[PDB]
């Protein structure tokens with residue numbers, strides 16, 4: 001039941017009698033889905049992430065069947081370009097992040113070394129790119145723009161940047177911006193042999 005990050009980690013979920021594809025996002029606390037038909041009463045919670053914010057309707061004790069494994073918990077519903085399975089449900093259906101093994105009961109944080117500085121970063125199977133907080137980074141970049149849930153943010157795209165994550169090396173592309181969390185995305189994650197399990 002191993003899954004690599006070379007491609008986006010998508011799974012089939014049965015929720016509300018219907019079928020959707022979703023992303024397994026070790027970088028999200030919460031599970032959020034596109035605008036779909038779910039019965040019951042909800043809570044007007046607001047969710048936050050890069051690019052800004054978005055409002056969603058909170059449901060509790062909703063049943064969801066991910067890759068044919070049942071789980072019950074809080075699903076959230078609002079405008080998301082992607083269906084996302086966050087950590088609340090991953091923990092339950094038993095998902096582990098291996099590379100020895102990181103559980104999702106807490107946020108998967110590692111300490112990385114980049115540009116001679118030490119930082120704490122989030123292991124995010126839900127991100128295709130690696131985005132770091134604003135820091136001093138020598139070299140040359142190009143002015144790429146990127147998007148999350150609450151909108152979009154401008155960031156500097158340095159390439160060939162070297163990083164030591166939890167005691168392994170990887171050279172690759174890093175982005176630097178106004179993000180509140182350091183994100184280790186799937187591009188560097190693939191180079192250090194992280195995988196998902198059941």
Ligand SMILES: CC(C)(C)NC(=O)[C@@H]1C[C@@H]2CCCC[C@@H]2CN1C[C@@H](O)[C@H](Cc1ccccc1)NC(=O)[C@H](CC(N)=O)NC(=O)c1ccc2ccccc2n1
Nearest residue numbers: 027028029030047048049050126127128129147148149181
């Ligand atoms: C990094 C980048 C390349 C931009 N990709 C992404 O950001 C993609 C974009 C995708 C398409 C749109 C829908 C979201 C998905 C998943 N995201 C990654 C995805 O992993 C994103 C990573 C992240 C973490 C923390 C803060 C910001 C952003 N997580 C999230 O958006 C989830 C939403 C949720 N769980 O309710 N955010 C959080 O879990 C979360 C946790 C702590 C926080 C503290 C302060 C402020 C915000 C905080 N947000």
